[PDB]
Amino acid sequence: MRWYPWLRPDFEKLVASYQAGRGHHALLIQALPGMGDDALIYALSRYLLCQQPQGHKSCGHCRGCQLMQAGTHPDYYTLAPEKGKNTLGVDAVREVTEKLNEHARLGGAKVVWVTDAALLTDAAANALLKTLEEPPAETWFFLATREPERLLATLRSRCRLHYLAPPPEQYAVTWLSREVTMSQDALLAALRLSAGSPGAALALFQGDNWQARETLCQALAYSVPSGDWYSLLAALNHEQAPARLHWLATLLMDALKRHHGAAQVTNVDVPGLVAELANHLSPSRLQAILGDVCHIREQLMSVTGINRELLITDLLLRIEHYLQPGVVLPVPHL
Amino acid sequence: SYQVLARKWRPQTFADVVGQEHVLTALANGLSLGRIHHAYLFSGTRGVGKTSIARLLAKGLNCETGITATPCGVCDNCREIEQGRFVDLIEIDAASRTKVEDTRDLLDNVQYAPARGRFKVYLIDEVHMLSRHSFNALLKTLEEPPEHVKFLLATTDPQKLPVTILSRCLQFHLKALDVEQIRHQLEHILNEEHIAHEPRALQLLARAAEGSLRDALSLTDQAIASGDGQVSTQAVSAMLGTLDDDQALSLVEAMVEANGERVMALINEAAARGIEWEALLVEMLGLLHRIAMVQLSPAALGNDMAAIELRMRELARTIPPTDIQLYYQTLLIGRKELPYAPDRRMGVEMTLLRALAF
Amino acid sequence: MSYQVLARKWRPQTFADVVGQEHVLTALANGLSLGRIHHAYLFSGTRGVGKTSIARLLAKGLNCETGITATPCGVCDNCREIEQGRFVDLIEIDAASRTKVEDTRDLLDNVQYAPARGRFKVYLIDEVHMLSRHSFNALLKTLEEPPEHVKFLLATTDPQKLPVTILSRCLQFHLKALDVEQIRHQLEHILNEEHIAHEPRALQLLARAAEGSLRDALSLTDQAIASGDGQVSTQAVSAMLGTLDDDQALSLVEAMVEANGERVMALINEAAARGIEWEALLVEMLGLLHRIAMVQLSPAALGNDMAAIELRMRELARTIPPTDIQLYYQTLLIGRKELPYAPDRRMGVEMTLLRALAFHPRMPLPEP
Amino acid sequence: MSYQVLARKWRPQTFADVVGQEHVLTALANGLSLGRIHHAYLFSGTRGVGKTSIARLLAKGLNCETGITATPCGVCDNCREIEQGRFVDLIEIDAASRTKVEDTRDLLDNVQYAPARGRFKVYLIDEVHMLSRHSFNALLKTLEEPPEHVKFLLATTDPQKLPVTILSRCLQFHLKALDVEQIRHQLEHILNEEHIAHEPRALQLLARAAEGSLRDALSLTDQAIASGDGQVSTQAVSAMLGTLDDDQALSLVEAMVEANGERVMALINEAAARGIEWEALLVEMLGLLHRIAMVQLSPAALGNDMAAIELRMRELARTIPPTDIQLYYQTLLIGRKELPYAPDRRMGVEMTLLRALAFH
Amino acid sequence: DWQSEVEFTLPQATMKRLIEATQFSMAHQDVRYYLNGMLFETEGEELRTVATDGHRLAVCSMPIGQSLPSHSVIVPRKGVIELMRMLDGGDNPLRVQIGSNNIRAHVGDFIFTSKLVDGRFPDYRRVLPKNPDKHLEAGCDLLKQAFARAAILSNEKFRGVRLYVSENQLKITANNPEQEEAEEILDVTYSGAEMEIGFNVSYVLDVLNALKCENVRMMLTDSVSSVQIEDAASQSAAYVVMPMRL
Ligand SMILES: Nc1ncnc2c1ncn2[C@@H]1O[C@H](COP(=O)(O)OP(=O)(O)O)[C@@H](O)[C@H]1O
Ligand SMILES: Nc1ncnc2c1ncn2[C@@H]1O[C@H](COP(=O)(O)OP(=O)(O)O)[C@@H](O)[C@H]1O
Ligand SMILES: Nc1ncnc2c1ncn2[C@@H]1O[C@H](COP(=O)(O)OP(=O)(O)O)[C@@H](O)[C@H]1O
Ligand code: BEF
Ligand code: BEF
Ligand code: BEF
Ligand SMILES: [Mg+2]
Ligand SMILES: [Mg+2]
Ligand SMILES: [Zn+2]
Ligand SMILES: [Zn+2]
Ligand SMILES: [Zn+2]
Ligand SMILES: [Zn+2]
Known part of the structure; x- marks a missing residue:
C-alpha cells in the first residue's frame, strides 16, 4: 500500500467524524483500483486502535501503534481470500464473527477490514450481516469495493457509503508526469483508460502491459484495413483479457466519438488508428463490435474457469462475420 | 453508548413502527385474540422492519404481564429481549449455521422446556441461505413444533425458499415504505x-x-x-451528487437533435464536475417521462420548473411520442447495464451515443 | 383460549375427512379391505396436498385394535396415540439426516424386531428423494423384502430424482393439487x-x-x-x-385499449391514493390481458370467478384482435421488467402505459 | 387371507419359469451340465429384469444333493433354504453398503473358510459397479485364484462403469429388457x-x-x-x-404442433395439477424440440434414453419441416426469457404456448 | 496496565470446588455467545459461580470471609478449562484479578490470563423455581446407582428418563428408539401428589456427580417447570434441570 497526496481531504472528512464519536461502525468506501481506498482503511484503523491520538493521526510509537506496525495487533482484523483463491469463504468471516464476541484484548477498539467486499461470497456477506447491523461496543468495520452496486443490497444497506472522487485530470497528469517520464498523450490514454484512476495508470506503465497495448495497436494497424481481426488473438490472450478487451472497446468508442465529432477521446496516443477505425468501419458495425467486446469482457470477468482462448477466438470470428456486408447486427434490448 | 440512527431508533412498540399497518394489525389482533401461529416468516426488502417486527412479536408473546399486543418494555423479559440477552430467544444466522450438526442442535434444543419465557422463540435471519439438507430436516419442527416452541423467519427473497417451507409458515410481506x-x-x-x-x-x-x-x-x-x-x-x-433539471434538460435536447458535439462536451463537463452517472440517467428518464406527459395532455406539466417549461413545451411539441419512448427505453437499458460496464462513464457514454444513432 | 392452528387442529384423521385425492383414498381403502397391503408406498405430490396426513391415516388403519379396516376404524388406543403424535407404530424419519449409507445401515439393522403393541412397524421416510444413491441401493434389499411386521411409507415431492430401481419396488401414488x-x-x-x-x-x-x-x-x-x-x-x-378492485385495473385496461389518455391519468392517480403497490397493478393488468387472450383461445378459459366483469371480458375479446392483445401484453411485460430501473415505480407504470398508448395498433398518439 | 405381494410370491423357482433371457439360460445350463463352471459369473441388465433371480437359481443349482446341475430338484433342503432366504453360506451383499476397502477386505477374508453346507460358497453382490476402485481391485485379486469351492455372483444395472479388467476375471451375461x-x-x-x-x-x-x-x-x-x-x-x-403420467412435455409439443389449442389447454391444466415447475417444463420442451431437429439431421442422433417414446419422435421428425422447428424453438426461448417477469407462471407458460400456436 | 476491579485472595481448593460444581453445565459453541462461558459474581463476602446452557443451570455460592463490591463477569469456556487444567489440590493462596475486559490468576508460581466475553449473563435468580414446595430427599449414591441402571440401555441420540413421583416410591422409566423399557423403584421419603416429569438422565447424573454428599433434596413445583437439586444438608450450590417434552 501507499499514500496519495490528493487522498488527504477524504481522510480528514472521515477521521473527524470518528473523533466526534458519531462515526458509523460500518464504512463502505467506493473507489476504483489504484485510487487508494486501502490507504484510508489502514490509516483509519491505525488511528482507531491508537490509544492517545495526536491531531487525528497515529502517534509515533504507541503500544497500539507498535502492534500495528508489527502487524500482530490482537484487536485488528483482516479478511482477505487465501492467496490460492479469489473468494472469501464462510469460515474466514465466521472465525472473525465468533472471535469478535470477546472483549478487546488491549481494552480499546475492535477494528475489522474486509480487503474487497466484491470478493465476498454471498454466504460470507449474509454471515457478516448480523455483525454489521449490531456490532458490539467499540467495534468498527471497513469495506472497500470498485462499485457498491455489485455488492449485496442488504450488505451495503448497513454501511455509510463514502466516495473517493478521482483527482482533477490536470492534477493527475501532473502526478503521472512526475512519476513516469513520457509523452502527455500516453498519460492521457492511461488516465482515460483507467477511468481517472492515476494509481491504475502507474500500474499500467510500470508493468509490461503498456507494451502489450502497443502490440495490440500495431496488430490493429494491420487488422482493420484488411479484415483480419483473428490475428489479434495473440495480442489479447495473455491472462489479461479484461484489460486488452477494455482497450479495444475504448478504441472502438473513440472511433464512434470521431464519427459524432468530439473534442476529447481516450486513445489520443494513436489518432491515426482511430481515424482508420472510423473510416474503414460502418457506424452500426462499430456499435455491434463494441457491444460484443464489452459482453465478452463481462463474461470473462464473471465466469470462473472459462477458457480465455476459445472466447477470444469466437469474439474475433464474430467480428469478422460482422465485417461482411448484409449481416444483421445486434442491438441491446430488454 | 452512542448508537447510529437505525439501531438507536429501532421500534420498541407497535405504535413506533412506520407503515406496515397491514401486518401490524394482524399481529396485534393475533396476540389479543389468542390466535398465535408457531411459524412466522416476515419477508421484504432491506430496511423495512422484518427484524424489528419479529423482535416486537417476541416481546409481546412472552411478557410476564401476559400475552399482550402492547409489551410494557420495563419488564424483565422485554428488557432482556430488547438487549438480546434473553436465552429463550435464539437468534440464528442461516448462512453462518447451515450444517447437519447445527440442524441436529436445533432439533434437540427444541425438545427442552423454556428457561425463562413462556415460549422458546427461534429468530432465523436470511433463512433462504440454509442448505437443502437443513430445510428438509427442519420440515417437521416447523410443521408440528412442541407446545412451547415458536419460529420467526426473515428473508429478503421468499422465492429462494423451498415452497414446502413457505407452505408451513405465516407469510408477512412488508411493503417498501x-x-x-x-x-x-x-x-x-x-x-x-x-x-x-x-x-x-x-x-x-x-x-x-x-x-x-x-x-x-x-x-x-x-x-x-x-x-x-x-x-x-x-x-x-x-x-x-445530484443535479438540477437544467443540465439534464440540456443533455436531452442535445441528444434528441443528434448533436454529437454538444452531447459529448456536456458529458465531459459532467465528468469534470464529478456528478453521478446513475443520477444523470435518472434525471434523463424523469425528463423524458415529463416530456411524454406534456405530449399526452398539455395541463399535465410540472409547476416547480416554470423557468424551463419554455423549452420543455417546445421539445414536447416537436418530437413524436414514439421517438421519446425509444429514447426512454434506450436510457433505461443503459441504466440497467451501467454496473456491468468497464466504467460507469464509459457505459453512460455508450448509452447516450447509441441513443444518438436513431 | 389457545385456538390450535387450523393445519394442526384440522388435520384429517379419517378417510371420510380427506378432500380430494380420490385415487389414493380409493386405493388405500380397497387394498386394506381386500387385505393386499404392499410393503412399500410412494406418495408423490406437491407441498401440502396430504401425503403425510394420508400416510398417518393408513398407519392408523393398519394398526386398529379392532381389526384391519379400510379407513381408520373406531379410534382405539393405537389410533389416538397416533393422532397425538405419540409412537405406537409410526417411525417418522427425515431422509435429510440419514442420507449417508452409514446411517441407512443402522436403520436397516433395527428393522428385524417385533413391534410393541402394534401389528406393524410403519416407517415414514419423508423427503425420500434426499437420500444418497449408496443409501438407496443399501435399503434396496430391505425394500424388496422387509420383515412381515415392517412397512415402508415413502413421501416425496419430486419422484424424478428417485432411481428407477427403487421406483420399481414401490406402489406409486401421485396426489394432484386440489x-x-x-x-x-x-x-x-x-x-x-x-x-x-x-x-x-x-x-x-x-x-x-x-x-x-x-x-x-x-x-x-x-x-x-x-x-x-x-x-x-x-x-x-x-x-x-394486496389485490386491488378489479374495476380499477379493468377500467385502466379499457382506457388503454380505447386510446384515451385523460381517462388513464384519472384512473392511475386515483389508484395512487388507494395504497396499492404499482407492480401489482401491472401484474393485475397483465393477468387480465392474458385472461382476454385465453378467452380468445376458447370460451372455456373465462374462470368461474370474475363473473362481475365477465361480460366485459367477452366484449373486449370480441372487439380486440389477438395481435393487439399480444402487443399490449408484450409492452406491459417489458414495462414491468423495466420497472426496477425506472426513476419511480409510479413513474415506470405511467411510462409503460403511455408507451402502450403511443404504439397503439389502431389509435396511436397524434404526432407532429 | 394371505393376499401377499405378487412380486416376490411369483419369483421364479425353476429355470423354466424365467421369462426371456433364453440365451443366458441356455448358456448357464450348458455350463452346469457338460462344461466346467467358470469361477465367477457377472450379471448385467435393467431394473426388474431377472438378474438376482437368475443368480439365486444358479446358486440353487450349485448347492444341492442331486449335484451341480441346471434343474436340480424341487423342495429339497438347500433349494428351500435358499428360497426362504435362510441359507447360511449364500452370502448376500449390497455393494453400496460395503464400498469401503476395509469392509471389502473383511468380506474377502471369508472365502478361505469352507462352506457350512452344500458344495460351493456362493457370494451374491448387488449393484457391483458401485464398489470403490480399491475394493474392486481386491475383488479381482481374490477372483484370479479362488478356492476350488468358492464362487462369486455379481449383478449391476449399468455395467458401463465397470472397468474393462472385470472381463478378464468373470464371465458376463447381459439380460435384455423384456x-x-x-x-x-x-x-x-x-x-x-x-x-x-x-x-x-x-x-x-x-x-x-x-x-x-x-x-x-x-x-x-x-x-x-x-x-x-x-x-x-x-x-x-x-x-x-394417467394419474402417473409424466409425458406432458411431449404431448404439449405434439398438440402445439397440431395447432390444437384445447388439447394444449387441457394438458397444461393437467401439468398444473401435477405441480410441475414451469421453467423445467419449458426447458425440457426446448430439449425435445432440439432432439427432433437433430434426429431430422441424422437418424442416429437418437439414443436409448428416448427409446420409450422414439416412435412418436420419429413421426414428429418425419412430418415437421425444420423451419417450423426453428420458429417454435425461438418462440419457446423468448417465452422462457420472459417467464420470470410474467404473472403467475402457470399462465405465462400458457401464453408462450399461445404465441407458438399463433404461427398457424 | 491493569486496574483490578475485583481482587480475590482465595484458597485454590475453594475455587477448584466452585468451578467443579458448575463446569459440566456449560455451553459448547452455542448460538448464544454469552453462554459459551461461566459467570463470576461477587456479593459482599460471597463468591458465586454460575453456568448454564439453556437446558442446565449450575450455581455455586460460597462465602469467602472477605467483603468485595458486587460484580459480574463472564469468563469463556477455554479460560476456565485452562484454569482447571492448571489448578491443583494444594494450599497455595490463589489470587484472582478482575478488570474491565480480562481475567488474571496468580497461582503460586504460575500466571493464567484470559479475556472476558462481552455480554450480560442472564439472571439466575429467576431461573430457580419460585415455588419449591415438593421435596424428594434421598441418598445421593442410591439415586446415582438407580439413574445409571436406568440409563444403561439409553442411547446417545435418545437420552431421557421419566420420573413418576408417588407417596414413597420414585419410579425412573427409560425408553429407547429400539422400543425397550427400563424401570427403577426407590424408597425416597416424600409426601405429595403423584406426578410425571421427564429430564435428560445425563444432566441429572452430572448434577449428582457434582454433589459429593450422603443425600440430596430435589425441589419440584409441577410437571412443566424446572426442577432444582441441592444438598439436603447444605445450601452452598444449587442446580436446575429443565424438563423435556413428552
Ligand atoms: N417500519 C419501520 N419503522 C421504523 N423504523 C424502521 C422501519 N423499518 C426499518 N426501520 C429502521 O431500519 C433499521 C433496520 O430495520 P430492520 O427491521 O432490521 O429491517 P430488516 O427488515 O431489513 O431486517 C431499524 O433500526 C429502523 O431504524
Ligand atoms: N386432502 C386433504 N384434505 C384435508 N386437508 C388437507 C389435505 N391435504 C392437505 N391438507 C391440509 O394441509 C395440512 C398439512 O397437510 P400434509 O398432509 O402435511 O401435506 P403433505 O403432503 O405436504 O405433508 C393438513 O393439516 C390439512 O389441513
Ligand atoms: N425373467 C423374469 N422371470 C420372472 N420374474 C421376473 C423376471 N424378471 C423380473 N422378475 C420379477 O421381478 C422381481 C424382482 O426381480 P429382480 O430379478 O430382482 O430384478 P433386477 O434385475 O432389477 O435385480 C422378481 O421377484 C420377479 O418377480
Ligand atoms: F436488511 Be433486512 F433484514 F432485509
Ligand atoms: F408439506 Be408436505 F409434506 F410437502
Ligand atoms: F431393479 Be434391479 F434390482 F436392478
Ligand atoms: Mg433483519
Ligand atoms: Mg437387483
Ligand atoms: Zn498511538
Ligand atoms: Zn414486558
Ligand atoms: Zn383403532
Ligand atoms: Zn435342490
Whole structure:
C-alpha cells in the first residue's frame, strides 16, 4: 500500500467524524483500483486502535501503534481470500464473527477490514450481516469495493457509503508526469483508460502491459484495413483479457466519438488508428463490435474457469462475420 | 453508548413502527385474540422492519404481564429481549449455521422446556441461505413444533425458499415504505434529536432511499457527517451528487437533435464536475417521462420548473411520442447495464451515443 | 383460549375427512379391505396436498385394535396415540439426516424386531428423494423384502430424482393439487366449525390465492382471521393479499385499449391514493390481458370467478384482435421488467402505459 | 387371507419359469451340465429384469444333493433354504453398503473358510459397479485364484462403469429388457393362476407402461388390482396410469404442433395439477424440440434414453419441416426469457404456448 | 496496565470446588455467545459461580470471609478449562484479578490470563423455581446407582428418563428408539401428589456427580417447570434441570 497526496481531504472528512464519536461502525468506501481506498482503511484503523491520538493521526510509537506496525495487533482484523483463491469463504468471516464476541484484548477498539467486499461470497456477506447491523461496543468495520452496486443490497444497506472522487485530470497528469517520464498523450490514454484512476495508470506503465497495448495497436494497424481481426488473438490472450478487451472497446468508442465529432477521446496516443477505425468501419458495425467486446469482457470477468482462448477466438470470428456486408447486427434490448 | 440512527431508533412498540399497518394489525389482533401461529416468516426488502417486527412479536408473546399486543418494555423479559440477552430467544444466522450438526442442535434444543419465557422463540435471519439438507430436516419442527416452541423467519427473497417451507409458515410481506412515510419519519427523528433540517433535503433523502428506511437513515447519518451536523439541501445534494433539471434538460435536447458535439462536451463537463452517472440517467428518464406527459395532455406539466417549461413545451411539441419512448427505453437499458460496464462513464457514454444513432 | 392452528387442529384423521385425492383414498381403502397391503408406498405430490396426513391415516388403519379396516376404524388406543403424535407404530424419519449409507445401515439393522403393541412397524421416510444413491441401493434389499411386521411409507415431492430401481419396488401414488372449489369448501367447513363469520368473496379470494394446496390456504386463512377480529371479509382478504378492485385495473385496461389518455391519468392517480403497490397493478393488468387472450383461445378459459366483469371480458375479446392483445401484453411485460430501473415505480407504470398508448395498433398518439 | 405381494410370491423357482433371457439360460445350463463352471459369473441388465433371480437359481443349482446341475430338484433342503432366504453360506451383499476397502477386505477374508453346507460358497453382490476402485481391485485379486469351492455372483444395472479388467476375471451375461409380448404373457399367466379378472387391453397398457421391466409390470398390476377391486379393466388401468403420467412435455409439443389449442389447454391444466415447475417444463420442451431437429439431421442422433417414446419422435421428425422447428424453438426461448417477469407462471407458460400456436 | 476491579485472595481448593460444581453445565459453541462461558459474581463476602446452557443451570455460592463490591463477569469456556487444567489440590493462596475486559490468576508460581466475553449473563435468580414446595430427599449414591441402571440401555441420540413421583416410591422409566423399557423403584421419603416429569438422565447424573454428599433434596413445583437439586444438608450450590417434552 501507499499514500496519495490528493487522498488527504477524504481522510480528514472521515477521521473527524470518528473523533466526534458519531462515526458509523460500518464504512463502505467506493473507489476504483489504484485510487487508494486501502490507504484510508489502514490509516483509519491505525488511528482507531491508537490509544492517545495526536491531531487525528497515529502517534509515533504507541503500544497500539507498535502492534500495528508489527502487524500482530490482537484487536485488528483482516479478511482477505487465501492467496490460492479469489473468494472469501464462510469460515474466514465466521472465525472473525465468533472471535469478535470477546472483549478487546488491549481494552480499546475492535477494528475489522474486509480487503474487497466484491470478493465476498454471498454466504460470507449474509454471515457478516448480523455483525454489521449490531456490532458490539467499540467495534468498527471497513469495506472497500470498485462499485457498491455489485455488492449485496442488504450488505451495503448497513454501511455509510463514502466516495473517493478521482483527482482533477490536470492534477493527475501532473502526478503521472512526475512519476513516469513520457509523452502527455500516453498519460492521457492511461488516465482515460483507467477511468481517472492515476494509481491504475502507474500500474499500467510500470508493468509490461503498456507494451502489450502497443502490440495490440500495431496488430490493429494491420487488422482493420484488411479484415483480419483473428490475428489479434495473440495480442489479447495473455491472462489479461479484461484489460486488452477494455482497450479495444475504448478504441472502438473513440472511433464512434470521431464519427459524432468530439473534442476529447481516450486513445489520443494513436489518432491515426482511430481515424482508420472510423473510416474503414460502418457506424452500426462499430456499435455491434463494441457491444460484443464489452459482453465478452463481462463474461470473462464473471465466469470462473472459462477458457480465455476459445472466447477470444469466437469474439474475433464474430467480428469478422460482422465485417461482411448484409449481416444483421445486434442491438441491446430488454 | 452512542448508537447510529437505525439501531438507536429501532421500534420498541407497535405504535413506533412506520407503515406496515397491514401486518401490524394482524399481529396485534393475533396476540389479543389468542390466535398465535408457531411459524412466522416476515419477508421484504432491506430496511423495512422484518427484524424489528419479529423482535416486537417476541416481546409481546412472552411478557410476564401476559400475552399482550402492547409489551410494557420495563419488564424483565422485554428488557432482556430488547438487549438480546434473553436465552429463550435464539437468534440464528442461516448462512453462518447451515450444517447437519447445527440442524441436529436445533432439533434437540427444541425438545427442552423454556428457561425463562413462556415460549422458546427461534429468530432465523436470511433463512433462504440454509442448505437443502437443513430445510428438509427442519420440515417437521416447523410443521408440528412442541407446545412451547415458536419460529420467526426473515428473508429478503421468499422465492429462494423451498415452497414446502413457505407452505408451513405465516407469510408477512412488508411493503417498501412510501416516500412520504419515510420523509415524515426523518422529520420526527430529527425533531426528537434536535437536528436542524430542511424539507427539500428530507425529500431528496427520501427519494434517494429506494423505499427503505435503513437506507434513508444511513444517508441521513452521511448528511450529518458532512456539513457540521445539519441536514441542508446543499449538503444532501453534494453527498448524493445530484443535479438540477437544467443540465439534464440540456443533455436531452442535445441528444434528441443528434448533436454529437454538444452531447459529448456536456458529458465531459459532467465528468469534470464529478456528478453521478446513475443520477444523470435518472434525471434523463424523469425528463423524458415529463416530456411524454406534456405530449399526452398539455395541463399535465410540472409547476416547480416554470423557468424551463419554455423549452420543455417546445421539445414536447416537436418530437413524436414514439421517438421519446425509444429514447426512454434506450436510457433505461443503459441504466440497467451501467454496473456491468468497464466504467460507469464509459457505459453512460455508450448509452447516450447509441441513443444518438436513431 | 389457545385456538390450535387450523393445519394442526384440522388435520384429517379419517378417510371420510380427506378432500380430494380420490385415487389414493380409493386405493388405500380397497387394498386394506381386500387385505393386499404392499410393503412399500410412494406418495408423490406437491407441498401440502396430504401425503403425510394420508400416510398417518393408513398407519392408523393398519394398526386398529379392532381389526384391519379400510379407513381408520373406531379410534382405539393405537389410533389416538397416533393422532397425538405419540409412537405406537409410526417411525417418522427425515431422509435429510440419514442420507449417508452409514446411517441407512443402522436403520436397516433395527428393522428385524417385533413391534410393541402394534401389528406393524410403519416407517415414514419423508423427503425420500434426499437420500444418497449408496443409501438407496443399501435399503434396496430391505425394500424388496422387509420383515412381515415392517412397512415402508415413502413421501416425496419430486419422484424424478428417485432411481428407477427403487421406483420399481414401490406402489406409486401421485396426489394432484386440489382445485380452488375444494379449497374454498374446506375453508368454509373450517370457519363454520370454528364459529367465525365469513364472506363468500373472501373465501373465493383465499382459495384462489392458495396455489392448489390446502396448507397455504389454511395459513392464508389464519392470516386473514388475524387481519380481522375473528372474521374474514373481502376488505380484509384483499388488503392481506394486496389485490386491488378489479374495476380499477379493468377500467385502466379499457382506457388503454380505447386510446384515451385523460381517462388513464384519472384512473392511475386515483389508484395512487388507494395504497396499492404499482407492480401489482401491472401484474393485475397483465393477468387480465392474458385472461382476454385465453378467452380468445376458447370460451372455456373465462374462470368461474370474475363473473362481475365477465361480460366485459367477452366484449373486449370480441372487439380486440389477438395481435393487439399480444402487443399490449408484450409492452406491459417489458414495462414491468423495466420497472426496477425506472426513476419511480409510479413513474415506470405511467411510462409503460403511455408507451402502450403511443404504439397503439389502431389509435396511436397524434404526432407532429 | 394371505393376499401377499405378487412380486416376490411369483419369483421364479425353476429355470423354466424365467421369462426371456433364453440365451443366458441356455448358456448357464450348458455350463452346469457338460462344461466346467467358470469361477465367477457377472450379471448385467435393467431394473426388474431377472438378474438376482437368475443368480439365486444358479446358486440353487450349485448347492444341492442331486449335484451341480441346471434343474436340480424341487423342495429339497438347500433349494428351500435358499428360497426362504435362510441359507447360511449364500452370502448376500449390497455393494453400496460395503464400498469401503476395509469392509471389502473383511468380506474377502471369508472365502478361505469352507462352506457350512452344500458344495460351493456362493457370494451374491448387488449393484457391483458401485464398489470403490480399491475394493474392486481386491475383488479381482481374490477372483484370479479362488478356492476350488468358492464362487462369486455379481449383478449391476449399468455395467458401463465397470472397468474393462472385470472381463478378464468373470464371465458376463447381459439380460435384455423384456418386450411388451413377454411381459404381457407373463402377467396374463400370473392373473390366470391367481384368478384375477382382466382384459387384454389392460394387460397391454400395463406392459407398455412397464417399459421393459417385469418388476414394474408386477407393481403396476398390484396397484391396478388394489384400485379396481380385482376387476382389472382397461378403463381402470388407463385412469390410474394417467394419474402417473409424466409425458406432458411431449404431448404439449405434439398438440402445439397440431395447432390444437384445447388439447394444449387441457394438458397444461393437467401439468398444473401435477405441480410441475414451469421453467423445467419449458426447458425440457426446448430439449425435445432440439432432439427432433437433430434426429431430422441424422437418424442416429437418437439414443436409448428416448427409446420409450422414439416412435412418436420419429413421426414428429418425419412430418415437421425444420423451419417450423426453428420458429417454435425461438418462440419457446423468448417465452422462457420472459417467464420470470410474467404473472403467475402457470399462465405465462400458457401464453408462450399461445404465441407458438399463433404461427398457424 | 491493569486496574483490578475485583481482587480475590482465595484458597485454590475453594475455587477448584466452585468451578467443579458448575463446569459440566456449560455451553459448547452455542448460538448464544454469552453462554459459551461461566459467570463470576461477587456479593459482599460471597463468591458465586454460575453456568448454564439453556437446558442446565449450575450455581455455586460460597462465602469467602472477605467483603468485595458486587460484580459480574463472564469468563469463556477455554479460560476456565485452562484454569482447571492448571489448578491443583494444594494450599497455595490463589489470587484472582478482575478488570474491565480480562481475567488474571496468580497461582503460586504460575500466571493464567484470559479475556472476558462481552455480554450480560442472564439472571439466575429467576431461573430457580419460585415455588419449591415438593421435596424428594434421598441418598445421593442410591439415586446415582438407580439413574445409571436406568440409563444403561439409553442411547446417545435418545437420552431421557421419566420420573413418576408417588407417596414413597420414585419410579425412573427409560425408553429407547429400539422400543425397550427400563424401570427403577426407590424408597425416597416424600409426601405429595403423584406426578410425571421427564429430564435428560445425563444432566441429572452430572448434577449428582457434582454433589459429593450422603443425600440430596430435589425441589419440584409441577410437571412443566424446572426442577432444582441441592444438598439436603447444605445450601452452598444449587442446580436446575429443565424438563423435556413428552
Ligand atoms: N417500519 C419501520 N419503522 C421504523 N423504523 C424502521 C422501519 N423499518 C426499518 N426501520 C429502521 O431500519 C433499521 C433496520 O430495520 P430492520 O427491521 O432490521 O429491517 P430488516 O427488515 O431489513 O431486517 C431499524 O433500526 C429502523 O431504524
Ligand atoms: N386432502 C386433504 N384434505 C384435508 N386437508 C388437507 C389435505 N391435504 C392437505 N391438507 C391440509 O394441509 C395440512 C398439512 O397437510 P400434509 O398432509 O402435511 O401435506 P403433505 O403432503 O405436504 O405433508 C393438513 O393439516 C390439512 O389441513
Ligand atoms: N425373467 C423374469 N422371470 C420372472 N420374474 C421376473 C423376471 N424378471 C423380473 N422378475 C420379477 O421381478 C422381481 C424382482 O426381480 P429382480 O430379478 O430382482 O430384478 P433386477 O434385475 O432389477 O435385480 C422378481 O421377484 C420377479 O418377480
Ligand atoms: F436488511 Be433486512 F433484514 F432485509
Ligand atoms: F409434506 Be408436505 F410437502 F408439506
Ligand atoms: F434390482 Be434391479 F436392478 F431393479
Ligand atoms: Mg433483519
Ligand atoms: Mg437387483
Ligand atoms: Zn498511538
Ligand atoms: Zn414486558
Ligand atoms: Zn383403532
Ligand atoms: Zn435342490
